Amino acid sequence: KQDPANKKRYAEANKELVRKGKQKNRVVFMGNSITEGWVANDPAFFEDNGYVGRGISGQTSSHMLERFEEDVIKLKPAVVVIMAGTNDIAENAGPYNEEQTFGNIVKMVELARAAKIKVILTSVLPHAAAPWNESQKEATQAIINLNTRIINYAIENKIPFVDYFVEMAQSPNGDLNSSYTRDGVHPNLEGYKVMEALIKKAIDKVLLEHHHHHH
Template sequence: MKTKMLVKYFYLGITFITLTCGSIHAQDRDFGGLNRYAQENKNITVSAKPVKVVFMGNSITEGWVNCHPAFFTDNGYVGRGISGQTSSQFLLRFREDVIKLSPLLVVINAGTNDVAENTGSYNEEYTFGNIMSMVELAEVHKIKVILTSTLPAASFGWNPSIKDAKAKIASLNARIKAYAHEHKIPYVDYYAKMVYGDNGALNPKYTKDGVHPTAEGYDVMEALIKEAIDKVL
């Protein structure tokens, strides 16, 4: 009897340790990426330097800052893109990377990694809901919003199992555009200016991998978004 009880307690102890270690490990992962810009955000708030516009996005936004840094520094824009992130992760860090910086305006570009299923199966309702939630949070804090289309992509090199990217991106963009129109939010259509071919690909003039813009691609985007920002502000 004592042996059975000891064995029982032994396995209970192992289970407790496993669950505890698992929880600690999960907490260390920073799924939302809140630490990515933590120091830069702190520097901005401490300096009390006004932020004109925050660009919220994924690697397309992060690459934009790296490729054309002057576009951001010269115009008082701040890039808050994190490679690989989906809209749910944007929403998790929206307070830290947007609201606390008190910008006049936020530009939201989401959807690419959702469709690519970076954090799970794609569900348009969830992605669209995340975008709406970011808009609502911005409006509560008196931050103006510009919504942008998801960029065209026929496929994703890191997830070749996605065969219907064109249809999913087109559907999401139509929904974002309709929502923007209904709520009188400016909408910038990168897609229409950058799509190429019947498969909904990103124009090869503007990309090397079919997903991320080159410097020439960012030139196209800059002309479109700068005009929209100037109208809003």
């Protein structure tokens, strides 16, 4: 209970980013297992684009919020991509509560906006359900319910939302597309490439489209 939010994971890495100096258009990927696995499976996507991966496998959105100052705000990025809720739904650390998870995402958004960091919100991905645990429909319904709250919040607050789910979830029951996974639960490299095209378009829109003329 000394370091519940796991600030130790990236503490040394954050120190070296400081020693490297100011970076223009830095994008931080804040997330749980999905984000950690992305860096693991395609480090070039992050290195070649100057994106900073700050995913921690297993982490709850509550603990993500608690390390948001250290791993996002203090890195003074231009943009943060928030990928949260997957491990909350997986319940590896405790019972899932949609209201708390959604509230934690909102709190992270508000921390970023107060620090003048642009935000991109994202859909929790589909995954295969083990029948002994829950049905595929139950798994998919929970994910859709949380993603709906995130989308409507994003529309209300003029925040971009990247819907990985609609591109990766297969009929009839929302299983993760077999082309996009090896284990049915996590994306494989092909699945991450689908995600990369989507997120880079949203990042480039934030960094490059300015001065919306209102009439």
